[PDB]
Amino acid sequence: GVRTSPTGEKVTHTGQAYDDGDYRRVRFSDRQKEVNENFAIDLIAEQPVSEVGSRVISCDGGGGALGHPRVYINLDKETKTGTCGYCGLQFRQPHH
């Protein structure tokens, strides 16, 4: 979800938004900023949480060799769905 600034300046996922007083905004008129509308924060948020009944789940991320190293995910935290640092896919432990 891209957000706009008061001067109509759409913000990027990093949060950069040049204010009106910034002289560095003059390259922006007559032209445009390229904004990755697919904000990386919310195309992972809508992804569901898979249910695997094990204490440690591999996280290859699909594609076999095409993915991220198979860092093993610890699954015993009931209050925290264990997510992978590489791909961010949240993994869960069946509700006992």
Partner 1 sequence: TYKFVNMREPSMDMKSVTDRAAQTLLWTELVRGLGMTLSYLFREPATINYPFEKGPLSPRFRGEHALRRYPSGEERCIACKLCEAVCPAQAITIEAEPRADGSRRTTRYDIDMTKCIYCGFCQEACPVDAIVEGPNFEFSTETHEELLYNKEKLLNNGDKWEAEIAANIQADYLYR
Partner 2 sequence: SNLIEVFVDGQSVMVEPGTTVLQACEKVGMQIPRFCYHERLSVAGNCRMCLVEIEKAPKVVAACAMPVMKGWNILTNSEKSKKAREGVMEFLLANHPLDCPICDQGGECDLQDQSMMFGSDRSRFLEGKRAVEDKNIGPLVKTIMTRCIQCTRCIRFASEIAGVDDLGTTGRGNDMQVGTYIEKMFMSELSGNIIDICPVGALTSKPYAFTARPWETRKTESIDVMDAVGSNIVVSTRTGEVMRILPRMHEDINEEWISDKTR
Partner 3 sequence: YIRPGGVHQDLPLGLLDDIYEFSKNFSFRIDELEEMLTNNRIWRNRTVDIGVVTAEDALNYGFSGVMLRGSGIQWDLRKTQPYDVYDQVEFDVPIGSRGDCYDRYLCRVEEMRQSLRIISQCLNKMPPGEIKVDDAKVSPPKRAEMKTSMESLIHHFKLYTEGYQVPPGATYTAIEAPK
- Provide the mask over 22-61, with x wherever binding to partner 2 is found by CB under 8 A and - wherever it is not: ---------------------------------xx-x---
Could you please report the per-residue DSSP string of 35-69?
Answer: --SS-TTHHHHTS--EE--SSEE----SSTTSS--
Which two three-digit tokens encode residue 70?
């198979």
Q: Which residues are known binding-site members?
A: 59, 68, 84, 87
Among 13, 39, 87, 90, interactor with Zn ion by CB under 5 A: 87
Nearest CB to partner 2, comparing residues 9 and 73: 73
Q: Can residue 40 be called a binding residue for partner 1 (CB under 8 A)? A: yes
Could you give phi then psi for residue 25, rounded to 5 degrees? -90, -5
Indicate the annotated binding residues for Zn(2+): 59, 68, 84, 87
Q: How far apart are the C-alpha atoms of 81 and 92, rounded to whole Å? A: 5
Point out which residues bind Zn ion (CB under 5 A): 59, 61, 84, 86-87
